[PDB]
Tab-separated table of C-alpha atoms and ligand atoms in Angstrom:
chain	number	residue	atom	x	y	z
A	1	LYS	CA	-7.008	-44.259	-3.523
A	2	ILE	CA	-9.824	-43.177	-1.203
A	3	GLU	CA	-10.364	-45.395	1.881
A	4	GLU	CA	-13.750	-47.069	2.449
A	5	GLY	CA	-15.270	-46.669	5.972
A	6	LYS	CA	-13.673	-43.370	6.859
A	7	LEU	CA	-14.277	-39.696	5.965
A	8	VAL	CA	-11.593	-37.356	4.705
A	9	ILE	CA	-12.640	-33.665	4.441
A	10	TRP	CA	-10.746	-30.840	2.761
A	11	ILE	CA	-11.504	-27.236	3.777
A	12	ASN	CA	-9.670	-23.969	3.416
A	13	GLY	CA	-7.164	-22.993	6.121
A	14	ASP	CA	-8.981	-19.706	6.829
A	15	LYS	CA	-12.072	-21.581	8.054
A	16	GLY	CA	-12.940	-23.214	11.314
A	17	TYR	CA	-11.257	-26.495	10.550
A	18	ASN	CA	-10.486	-27.311	14.230
A	19	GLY	CA	-14.194	-26.853	15.031
A	20	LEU	CA	-15.166	-28.990	12.077
A	21	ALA	CA	-12.757	-31.648	13.393
A	22	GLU	CA	-14.777	-31.595	16.676
A	23	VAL	CA	-17.946	-32.305	14.725
A	24	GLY	CA	-15.968	-35.137	13.105
A	25	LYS	CA	-15.013	-36.454	16.540
A	26	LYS	CA	-18.661	-36.483	17.551
A	27	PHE	CA	-19.475	-38.481	14.404
A	28	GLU	CA	-16.735	-40.940	15.320
A	29	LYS	CA	-17.971	-41.271	18.927
A	30	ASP	CA	-21.536	-42.054	17.748
A	31	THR	CA	-20.640	-44.397	14.841
A	32	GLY	CA	-16.968	-45.547	15.115
A	33	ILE	CA	-16.346	-43.936	11.708
A	34	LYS	CA	-13.145	-41.891	11.697
A	35	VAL	CA	-13.276	-38.343	10.282
A	36	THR	CA	-10.065	-36.581	9.287
A	37	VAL	CA	-9.994	-32.915	8.434
A	38	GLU	CA	-7.200	-31.476	6.289
A	39	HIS	CA	-6.530	-28.015	4.871
A	40	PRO	CA	-4.071	-28.516	1.958
A	41	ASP	CA	-2.743	-25.382	0.333
A	42	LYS	CA	-4.428	-24.404	-2.894
A	43	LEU	CA	-6.972	-27.153	-2.264
A	44	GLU	CA	-9.328	-25.670	-4.862
A	45	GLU	CA	-6.796	-26.394	-7.651
A	46	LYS	CA	-5.568	-29.684	-6.084
A	47	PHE	CA	-9.079	-31.119	-5.824
A	48	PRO	CA	-9.723	-31.435	-9.590
A	49	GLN	CA	-6.286	-32.918	-10.134
A	50	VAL	CA	-6.528	-35.716	-7.539
A	51	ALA	CA	-10.266	-36.414	-7.961
A	52	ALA	CA	-9.758	-36.942	-11.730
A	53	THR	CA	-7.669	-39.998	-10.668
A	54	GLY	CA	-10.328	-41.100	-8.165
A	55	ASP	CA	-8.274	-39.882	-5.172
A	56	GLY	CA	-8.790	-36.864	-2.909
A	57	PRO	CA	-11.165	-36.166	-0.057
A	58	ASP	CA	-14.621	-37.646	0.372
A	59	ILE	CA	-15.968	-34.113	1.018
A	60	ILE	CA	-14.691	-30.828	-0.265
A	61	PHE	CA	-15.547	-27.386	1.139
A	62	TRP	CA	-15.200	-24.271	-0.933
A	63	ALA	CA	-17.333	-21.350	-2.003
A	64	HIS	CA	-19.948	-22.392	-4.584
A	65	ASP	CA	-18.338	-20.626	-7.593
A	66	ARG	CA	-15.863	-23.532	-8.110
A	67	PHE	CA	-18.430	-26.360	-8.015
A	68	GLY	CA	-19.921	-26.034	-11.529
A	69	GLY	CA	-16.457	-26.670	-12.897
A	70	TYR	CA	-16.038	-29.709	-10.721
A	71	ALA	CA	-19.478	-31.019	-11.664
A	72	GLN	CA	-19.006	-30.503	-15.384
A	73	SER	CA	-15.843	-32.582	-15.181
A	74	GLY	CA	-17.801	-35.378	-13.429
A	75	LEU	CA	-15.949	-34.907	-10.096
A	76	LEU	CA	-19.045	-34.505	-7.847
A	77	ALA	CA	-21.977	-36.694	-6.830
A	78	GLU	CA	-25.481	-35.443	-7.283
A	79	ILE	CA	-27.132	-34.726	-4.018
A	80	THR	CA	-30.816	-35.420	-3.304
A	81	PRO	CA	-31.959	-34.138	0.102
A	82	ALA	CA	-35.561	-34.854	1.045
A	83	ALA	CA	-38.031	-31.965	0.799
A	84	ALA	CA	-38.088	-31.825	4.594
A	85	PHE	CA	-34.334	-31.282	4.750
A	86	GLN	CA	-34.308	-28.664	1.963
A	87	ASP	CA	-36.857	-26.595	3.804
A	88	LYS	CA	-34.384	-26.320	6.708
A	89	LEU	CA	-32.073	-24.076	4.582
A	90	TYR	CA	-32.801	-20.789	2.830
A	91	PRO	CA	-33.950	-21.322	-0.733
A	92	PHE	CA	-31.446	-18.844	-2.187
A	93	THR	CA	-28.601	-21.024	-0.809
A	94	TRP	CA	-29.932	-24.077	-2.746
A	95	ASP	CA	-29.962	-21.905	-5.877
A	96	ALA	CA	-26.228	-21.243	-5.470
A	97	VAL	CA	-25.451	-24.980	-5.553
A	98	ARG	CA	-27.852	-25.864	-8.398
A	99	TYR	CA	-26.086	-26.562	-11.682
A	100	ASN	CA	-27.873	-27.718	-14.805
A	101	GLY	CA	-31.061	-28.485	-12.896
A	102	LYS	CA	-29.195	-30.669	-10.297
A	103	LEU	CA	-28.008	-29.986	-6.737
A	104	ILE	CA	-24.241	-30.523	-6.593
A	105	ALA	CA	-23.422	-29.608	-2.943
A	106	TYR	CA	-24.773	-28.693	0.458
A	107	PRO	CA	-24.938	-24.927	1.294
A	108	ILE	CA	-23.310	-24.142	4.647
A	109	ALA	CA	-22.933	-20.346	5.034
A	110	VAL	CA	-23.134	-17.045	3.255
A	111	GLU	CA	-19.874	-15.096	2.964
A	112	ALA	CA	-19.589	-11.461	1.986
A	113	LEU	CA	-16.780	-8.928	2.508
A	114	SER	CA	-17.367	-6.010	4.894
A	115	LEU	CA	-15.456	-2.962	6.040
A	116	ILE	CA	-13.732	-3.701	9.374
A	117	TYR	CA	-12.640	-0.658	11.314
A	118	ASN	CA	-10.742	0.235	14.486
A	119	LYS	CA	-13.118	2.228	16.704
A	120	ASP	CA	-10.347	3.887	18.727
A	121	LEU	CA	-8.594	5.238	15.616
A	122	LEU	CA	-11.786	5.816	13.647
A	123	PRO	CA	-15.095	6.005	15.575
A	124	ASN	CA	-16.935	7.062	12.428
A	125	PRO	CA	-15.637	5.075	9.443
A	126	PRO	CA	-15.779	6.832	6.033
A	127	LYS	CA	-18.901	6.325	3.863
A	128	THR	CA	-17.022	6.730	0.538
A	129	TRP	CA	-13.782	5.484	-1.056
A	130	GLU	CA	-13.075	9.062	-2.189
A	131	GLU	CA	-12.512	10.107	1.473
A	132	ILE	CA	-9.792	7.513	1.978
A	133	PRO	CA	-6.812	9.454	0.586
A	134	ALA	CA	-7.411	12.418	2.975
A	135	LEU	CA	-8.019	10.034	5.873
A	136	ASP	CA	-4.809	8.210	5.096
A	137	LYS	CA	-2.754	11.362	4.868
A	138	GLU	CA	-3.918	12.403	8.346
A	139	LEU	CA	-3.157	9.026	9.788
A	140	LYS	CA	0.334	8.855	8.268
A	141	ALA	CA	1.306	12.095	9.954
A	142	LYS	CA	0.629	10.174	13.264
A	143	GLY	CA	2.534	7.100	11.966
A	144	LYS	CA	-0.622	5.086	11.164
A	145	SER	CA	-2.517	4.414	7.962
A	146	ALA	CA	-6.128	4.435	6.739
A	147	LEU	CA	-6.607	1.118	5.024
A	148	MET	CA	-4.846	-2.169	4.284
A	149	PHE	CA	-6.320	-5.231	2.686
A	150	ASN	CA	-5.291	-8.232	0.557
A	151	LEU	CA	-4.371	-7.034	-2.919
A	152	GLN	CA	-3.042	-10.445	-4.086
A	153	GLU	CA	-6.571	-12.064	-4.332
A	154	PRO	CA	-9.045	-10.410	-6.656
A	155	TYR	CA	-11.897	-11.390	-4.379
A	156	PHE	CA	-10.853	-8.445	-2.120
A	157	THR	CA	-10.708	-5.754	-4.836
A	158	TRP	CA	-13.693	-6.855	-6.861
A	159	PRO	CA	-16.201	-4.961	-4.748
A	160	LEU	CA	-14.555	-1.713	-5.912
A	161	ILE	CA	-14.108	-2.800	-9.476
A	162	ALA	CA	-17.783	-3.808	-9.689
A	163	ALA	CA	-19.259	-0.713	-7.881
A	164	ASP	CA	-19.530	1.466	-10.992
A	165	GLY	CA	-20.166	-1.276	-13.509
A	166	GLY	CA	-17.548	-4.071	-13.665
A	167	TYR	CA	-19.096	-7.549	-14.008
A	168	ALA	CA	-18.096	-11.167	-14.698
A	169	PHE	CA	-20.579	-12.776	-17.115
A	170	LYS	CA	-23.897	-11.657	-18.506
A	171	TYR	CA	-26.897	-13.619	-17.407
A	172	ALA	CA	-30.218	-13.801	-19.198
A	173	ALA	CA	-32.852	-16.432	-19.755
A	174	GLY	CA	-31.189	-19.272	-17.821
A	175	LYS	CA	-27.841	-18.890	-19.592
A	176	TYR	CA	-24.576	-17.098	-18.995
A	177	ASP	CA	-23.063	-15.416	-22.092
A	178	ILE	CA	-19.549	-16.835	-21.930
A	179	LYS	CA	-18.227	-14.894	-24.946
A	180	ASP	CA	-18.506	-11.616	-23.046
A	181	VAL	CA	-16.590	-10.646	-19.884
A	182	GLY	CA	-17.429	-7.287	-18.270
A	183	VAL	CA	-13.999	-6.619	-16.874
A	184	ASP	CA	-12.884	-4.058	-19.479
A	185	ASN	CA	-15.676	-1.438	-19.233
A	186	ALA	CA	-15.640	2.138	-17.985
A	187	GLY	CA	-16.862	1.160	-14.482
A	188	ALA	CA	-14.268	-1.586	-14.094
A	189	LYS	CA	-11.497	0.732	-15.214
A	190	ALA	CA	-12.633	3.602	-12.926
A	191	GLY	CA	-12.605	1.259	-9.910
A	192	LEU	CA	-9.236	-0.273	-10.590
A	193	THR	CA	-7.813	3.121	-11.468
A	194	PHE	CA	-8.910	4.408	-8.052
A	195	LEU	CA	-7.104	1.525	-6.451
A	196	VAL	CA	-3.893	2.070	-8.465
A	197	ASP	CA	-4.016	5.785	-7.634
A	198	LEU	CA	-4.211	4.874	-3.942
A	199	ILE	CA	-0.946	3.007	-4.500
A	200	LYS	CA	0.706	5.729	-6.619
A	201	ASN	CA	-0.061	8.425	-4.025
A	202	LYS	CA	1.415	6.130	-1.363
A	203	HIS	CA	-1.859	5.373	0.476
A	204	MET	CA	-1.309	1.584	0.023
A	205	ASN	CA	1.591	-0.787	-0.766
A	206	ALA	CA	1.258	-3.003	-3.871
A	207	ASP	CA	2.477	-6.127	-2.126
A	208	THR	CA	0.037	-5.962	0.788
A	209	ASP	CA	-1.285	-9.492	1.179
A	210	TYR	CA	-3.553	-11.318	3.600
A	211	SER	CA	-1.030	-11.673	6.364
A	212	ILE	CA	0.458	-8.141	6.211
A	213	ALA	CA	-3.028	-6.620	6.182
A	214	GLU	CA	-4.108	-8.897	9.059
A	215	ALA	CA	-1.031	-8.107	11.174
A	216	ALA	CA	-1.361	-4.383	10.416
A	217	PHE	CA	-5.059	-4.241	11.505
A	218	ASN	CA	-4.807	-6.499	14.557
A	219	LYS	CA	-1.731	-4.731	15.842
A	220	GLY	CA	-3.426	-1.314	15.627
A	221	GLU	CA	-1.293	0.144	12.830
A	222	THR	CA	-4.092	0.694	10.220
A	223	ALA	CA	-7.584	1.917	10.867
A	224	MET	CA	-9.534	-0.327	8.440
A	225	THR	CA	-9.263	-3.616	6.549
A	226	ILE	CA	-11.567	-5.494	4.190
A	227	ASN	CA	-12.292	-9.125	5.098
A	228	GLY	CA	-14.820	-11.885	5.741
A	229	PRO	CA	-16.399	-13.371	8.884
A	230	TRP	CA	-13.559	-15.894	9.174
A	231	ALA	CA	-11.169	-13.093	10.152
A	232	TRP	CA	-13.210	-11.743	13.202
A	233	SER	CA	-11.852	-14.466	15.457
A	234	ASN	CA	-8.218	-13.264	15.318
A	235	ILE	CA	-9.262	-9.673	15.917
A	236	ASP	CA	-11.215	-10.808	19.017
A	237	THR	CA	-7.985	-12.148	20.548
A	238	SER	CA	-6.034	-8.987	19.553
A	239	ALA	CA	-6.196	-5.692	21.534
A	240	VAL	CA	-8.215	-3.988	18.788
A	241	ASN	CA	-11.684	-2.645	19.283
A	242	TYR	CA	-13.478	-3.208	15.999
A	243	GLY	CA	-16.764	-2.685	14.238
A	244	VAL	CA	-18.028	-4.217	11.005
A	245	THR	CA	-19.945	-2.141	8.487
A	246	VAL	CA	-21.098	-1.525	4.951
A	247	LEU	CA	-18.288	-1.105	2.463
A	248	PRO	CA	-17.622	2.358	1.209
A	249	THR	CA	-19.513	3.759	-1.736
A	250	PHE	CA	-17.696	4.630	-5.030
A	251	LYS	CA	-18.898	7.354	-7.391
A	252	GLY	CA	-21.853	7.272	-5.023
A	253	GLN	CA	-22.581	3.574	-5.833
A	254	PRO	CA	-22.564	0.681	-3.350
A	255	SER	CA	-19.399	-1.499	-3.443
A	256	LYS	CA	-20.574	-4.846	-4.837
A	257	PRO	CA	-18.783	-7.753	-3.319
A	258	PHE	CA	-19.071	-11.085	-5.084
A	259	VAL	CA	-21.045	-13.198	-2.543
A	260	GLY	CA	-19.972	-16.848	-1.915
A	261	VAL	CA	-22.035	-19.690	-0.421
A	262	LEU	CA	-19.535	-21.877	1.443
A	263	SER	CA	-20.626	-25.319	0.279
A	264	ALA	CA	-19.771	-28.980	0.790
A	265	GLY	CA	-19.652	-31.370	-2.156
A	266	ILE	CA	-19.137	-35.112	-2.265
A	267	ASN	CA	-16.296	-36.544	-4.436
A	268	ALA	CA	-17.889	-38.615	-7.216
A	269	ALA	CA	-15.106	-41.130	-6.666
A	270	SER	CA	-15.896	-41.537	-2.940
A	271	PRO	CA	-16.973	-44.993	-1.737
A	272	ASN	CA	-18.424	-43.208	1.313
A	273	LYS	CA	-21.210	-41.207	-0.201
A	274	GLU	CA	-23.899	-42.435	2.244
A	275	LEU	CA	-21.689	-41.714	5.288
A	276	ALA	CA	-20.853	-38.272	3.857
A	277	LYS	CA	-24.571	-37.515	3.462
A	278	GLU	CA	-25.216	-38.598	7.059
A	279	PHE	CA	-22.301	-36.516	8.352
A	280	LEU	CA	-23.344	-33.406	6.450
A	281	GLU	CA	-27.122	-33.578	7.071
A	282	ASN	CA	-27.169	-34.807	10.677
A	283	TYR	CA	-23.914	-33.540	12.225
A	284	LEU	CA	-22.626	-30.473	10.357
A	285	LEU	CA	-25.886	-28.838	9.290
A	286	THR	CA	-27.332	-28.624	12.811
A	287	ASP	CA	-27.345	-25.821	15.350
A	288	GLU	CA	-24.694	-27.582	17.399
A	289	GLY	CA	-22.483	-28.572	14.412
A	290	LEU	CA	-22.517	-25.076	12.962
A	291	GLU	CA	-21.933	-23.602	16.461
A	292	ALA	CA	-18.780	-25.688	16.888
A	293	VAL	CA	-17.410	-24.466	13.529
A	294	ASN	CA	-18.544	-20.903	14.107
A	295	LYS	CA	-16.832	-20.856	17.560
A	296	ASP	CA	-13.559	-21.659	15.796
A	297	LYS	CA	-13.943	-19.082	12.947
A	298	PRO	CA	-17.198	-17.303	12.106
A	299	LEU	CA	-19.038	-18.814	9.178
A	300	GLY	CA	-21.034	-15.725	8.350
A	301	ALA	CA	-24.783	-15.950	7.885
A	302	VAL	CA	-25.532	-19.646	7.983
A	303	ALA	CA	-27.815	-21.437	5.488
A	304	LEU	CA	-29.578	-23.225	8.301
A	305	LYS	CA	-32.596	-21.176	9.354
A	306	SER	CA	-32.851	-22.358	12.970
A	307	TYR	CA	-29.240	-21.295	13.721
A	308	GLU	CA	-29.301	-18.133	11.626
A	309	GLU	CA	-32.123	-16.788	13.819
A	310	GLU	CA	-29.671	-16.815	16.764
A	311	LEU	CA	-26.779	-15.340	14.699
A	312	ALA	CA	-28.994	-12.486	13.323
A	313	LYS	CA	-28.620	-10.608	16.652
A	314	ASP	CA	-24.896	-10.098	15.903
A	315	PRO	CA	-24.398	-6.666	14.217
A	316	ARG	CA	-21.410	-8.139	12.339
A	317	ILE	CA	-23.792	-10.565	10.641
A	318	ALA	CA	-26.292	-7.810	9.860
A	319	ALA	CA	-23.442	-5.884	8.219
A	320	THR	CA	-22.336	-9.024	6.332
A	321	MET	CA	-25.915	-9.330	4.991
A	322	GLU	CA	-26.119	-5.643	4.135
A	323	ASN	CA	-23.015	-6.003	1.967
A	324	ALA	CA	-24.252	-9.335	0.529
A	325	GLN	CA	-27.508	-7.713	-0.563
A	326	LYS	CA	-25.616	-4.845	-2.227
A	327	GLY	CA	-23.356	-7.356	-3.968
A	328	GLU	CA	-24.025	-10.292	-6.171
A	329	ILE	CA	-24.097	-14.084	-5.790
A	330	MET	CA	-21.231	-15.462	-7.826
A	331	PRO	CA	-21.913	-17.568	-10.857
A	332	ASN	CA	-21.035	-21.226	-10.439
A	333	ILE	CA	-20.292	-22.030	-14.117
A	334	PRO	CA	-16.942	-23.766	-15.004
A	335	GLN	CA	-15.629	-20.560	-16.596
A	336	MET	CA	-15.486	-18.734	-13.259
A	337	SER	CA	-12.057	-20.243	-12.682
A	338	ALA	CA	-10.788	-18.469	-15.826
A	339	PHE	CA	-12.519	-15.183	-14.877
A	340	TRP	CA	-10.638	-15.223	-11.519
A	341	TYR	CA	-7.256	-16.171	-12.856
A	342	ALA	CA	-7.522	-13.322	-15.344
A	343	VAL	CA	-8.712	-10.763	-12.760
A	344	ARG	CA	-6.006	-11.897	-10.289
A	345	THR	CA	-3.299	-11.161	-12.876
A	346	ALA	CA	-4.799	-7.806	-13.969
A	347	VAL	CA	-4.975	-6.508	-10.395
A	348	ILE	CA	-1.491	-7.649	-9.481
A	349	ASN	CA	-0.042	-6.221	-12.697
A	350	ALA	CA	-1.785	-2.864	-12.392
A	351	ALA	CA	-1.014	-2.582	-8.655
A	352	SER	CA	2.694	-3.343	-9.109
A	353	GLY	CA	2.952	-1.092	-12.166
A	354	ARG	CA	3.894	-3.911	-14.571
A	355	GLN	CA	0.914	-2.889	-16.735
A	356	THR	CA	-1.304	0.161	-17.006
A	357	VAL	CA	-4.906	-0.207	-15.777
A	358	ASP	CA	-6.164	-0.072	-19.386
A	359	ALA	CA	-3.692	-2.728	-20.709
A	360	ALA	CA	-4.135	-4.956	-17.621
A	361	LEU	CA	-7.896	-5.013	-17.921
A	362	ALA	CA	-7.909	-5.225	-21.759
A	363	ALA	CA	-5.706	-8.314	-21.422
A	364	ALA	CA	-7.886	-9.790	-18.681
A	365	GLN	CA	-10.941	-9.389	-20.902
A	366	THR	CA	-9.193	-11.056	-23.825
A	367	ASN	CA	-7.757	-13.977	-21.874
A	368	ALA	CA	-10.917	-14.624	-19.846
A	369	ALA	CA	-13.128	-14.563	-22.959
A	370	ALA	CA	-10.742	-16.885	-24.853
A	371	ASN	CA	-10.452	-19.485	-22.145
A	372	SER	CA	-14.186	-19.280	-21.388
A	373	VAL	CA	-15.193	-19.963	-25.012
A	374	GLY	CA	-12.376	-22.488	-25.180
A	375	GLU	CA	-13.875	-24.432	-22.287
A	376	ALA	CA	-17.236	-24.545	-24.041
A	377	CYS	CA	-15.577	-25.774	-27.306
A	378	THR	CA	-13.745	-28.388	-25.240
A	379	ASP	CA	-17.083	-29.586	-23.781
A	380	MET	CA	-18.511	-29.888	-27.296
A	381	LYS	CA	-15.394	-31.895	-28.215
A	382	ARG	CA	-15.729	-34.236	-25.275
A	383	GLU	CA	-19.347	-34.943	-26.294
A	384	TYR	CA	-18.248	-35.701	-29.854
A	385	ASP	CA	-15.541	-37.994	-28.477
A	386	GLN	CA	-17.875	-39.896	-26.178
A	387	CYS	CA	-20.219	-40.494	-29.107
A	388	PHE	CA	-17.367	-41.466	-31.436
A	389	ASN	CA	-15.440	-43.653	-28.994
A	390	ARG	CA	-18.666	-45.471	-28.160
A	391	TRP	CA	-19.625	-45.877	-31.852
A	392	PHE	CA	-16.113	-46.919	-32.928
A	393	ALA	CA	-15.609	-49.603	-30.245
A	394	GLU	CA	-19.181	-51.013	-30.065
A	395	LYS	CA	-20.160	-50.583	-33.758
A	396	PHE	CA	-17.307	-50.047	-36.205
A	397	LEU	CA	-14.747	-52.409	-34.668
A	398	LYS	CA	-17.502	-55.042	-34.350
A	399	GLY	CA	-18.227	-54.898	-38.071
A	400	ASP	CA	-21.700	-53.438	-37.511
A	401	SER	CA	-21.208	-49.952	-39.016
A	402	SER	CA	-23.465	-48.332	-41.626
A	403	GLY	CA	-22.424	-44.715	-41.083
A	404	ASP	CA	-20.909	-42.333	-38.614
A	405	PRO	CA	-23.700	-41.115	-36.294
A	406	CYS	CA	-21.477	-38.510	-34.637
A	407	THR	CA	-21.042	-36.053	-37.501
A	408	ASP	CA	-23.462	-33.335	-36.252
A	409	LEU	CA	-21.721	-33.376	-32.875
A	410	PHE	CA	-18.436	-32.752	-34.637
A	411	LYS	CA	-19.841	-29.891	-36.751
A	412	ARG	CA	-21.242	-28.138	-33.680
A	413	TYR	CA	-17.768	-28.395	-32.194
A	414	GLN	CA	-16.148	-27.246	-35.435
A	415	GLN	CA	-18.444	-24.215	-35.570
A	416	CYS	CA	-17.544	-23.310	-31.924
A	417	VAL	CA	-13.828	-23.394	-32.761
A	418	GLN	CA	-14.185	-21.513	-36.095
A	419	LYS	CA	-16.392	-18.875	-34.464
A	420	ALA	CA	-13.881	-18.456	-31.558
A	421	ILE	CA	-11.137	-17.608	-34.134
B	501	LIG	O1	-9.585	-14.245	-5.139
B	501	LIG	C1	-10.368	-15.038	-6.042
B	501	LIG	C2	-11.078	-16.182	-5.314
B	501	LIG	O2	-12.220	-15.614	-4.685
B	501	LIG	C3	-13.012	-16.502	-3.926
B	501	LIG	O3	-12.248	-17.164	-2.938
B	501	LIG	C4	-12.471	-16.691	-1.645
B	501	LIG	C5	-13.457	-17.628	-0.935
B	501	LIG	O4	-14.773	-17.678	-1.492
B	501	LIG	C6	-13.530	-17.285	0.545
B	501	LIG	O5	-14.067	-18.394	1.239
B	501	LIG	C7	-12.194	-16.911	1.188
B	501	LIG	O6	-11.622	-18.077	1.649
B	501	LIG	O7	-11.232	-16.279	0.358
B	501	LIG	C8	-11.095	-16.657	-0.981
B	501	LIG	C9	-10.218	-15.568	-1.565
B	501	LIG	O8	-8.935	-15.761	-1.070
B	501	LIG	C10	-13.565	-17.571	-4.823
B	501	LIG	O9	-14.385	-18.455	-4.093
B	501	LIG	C11	-12.389	-18.316	-5.483
B	501	LIG	O10	-12.996	-19.263	-6.336
B	501	LIG	C12	-11.471	-17.335	-6.234
B	501	LIG	O11	-10.259	-17.953	-6.642
């Protein structure tokens, strides 16, 4: 299980994990407390599995959308920064990591997708998605192409899908409507249909992934890609001369990327919660800690005000913020995981031709809604069970029963299930 007196951090392999390891070395030099940074594959799915057994990292980095799920399953410690420390970060970043009235992580940086373009191939990038076919056709005649980006992660296509009206979950009055997923409407279909038509008219390849799109852009073969701040670093070392700009408009509407707050949460099973708090508040979330990470791979717009004021001079960051403001902060509810799985499949199926746009999205809507409501019914069940298991062991089995207290909890659960059907 987790080791006492040591910090183990998990963070995604596309981030500045070597720079974070330098912050960890500084912590060790000051305190003698070893910090180890790992980037396991699919860490966002591995974390819940290992943490549920009380193993895993002391600190986990991911975008904020996954944290509500982790918190709801009891996998994260509550965090309680002093007022003085909170005021060092932008208030909207705290909002992203608030779940059920509690803070469940520290906000690190704001990530949004932008359009990245090769200035030598394309000194004026297109303002609209509708121009892309004609641009591509021209470029293919010269043995180049217009645009390549990662089709295998729905994060990258969502901005298009959402531009004319696709959504995830309704929000109103402090509550997400989990019965209703917005992935099957006219705007969602128009967006995805545009994408599939790019593929059908040979302007993109259906199995373009992160690495193929990254190699194609940084080797000068394609004129544009869609990516986050983390990717700028590899383009810097390539021979490509790039700019970063607002995503193209669709049906005259802004693309709407789903905006992530890269966040650090503390494993509820960690024996090192105080050391983790010290590391995060006094080493990572400082101008020099963020600089060391940023130097490795750009973080984006950082949550820390003092450092963001220096980063705001970078036009790449201004573009990141332009796109962020046109997009939307992701929800952090546990259902988000089901939303993404379902959109991932729909995109891949429609892009590869395994399903039509209309059947792919209809099926995503159905499966996301079912699992989302299912996760609520499961939470109602778990609450019944906690009440019953408590009552049965401490009351019934001790011969001190005069009725089952946990009947209304069951009926609420029963109603959830029977309504879902
Ligand atoms: O593709 C769905 C995926 O989107 C987001 O993951 C992003 C992440 O926020 C970024 O930091 C970056 O690393 O790329 C990921 C996409 O590959 C969501 O945060 C994630 O929950 C979801 O599965």
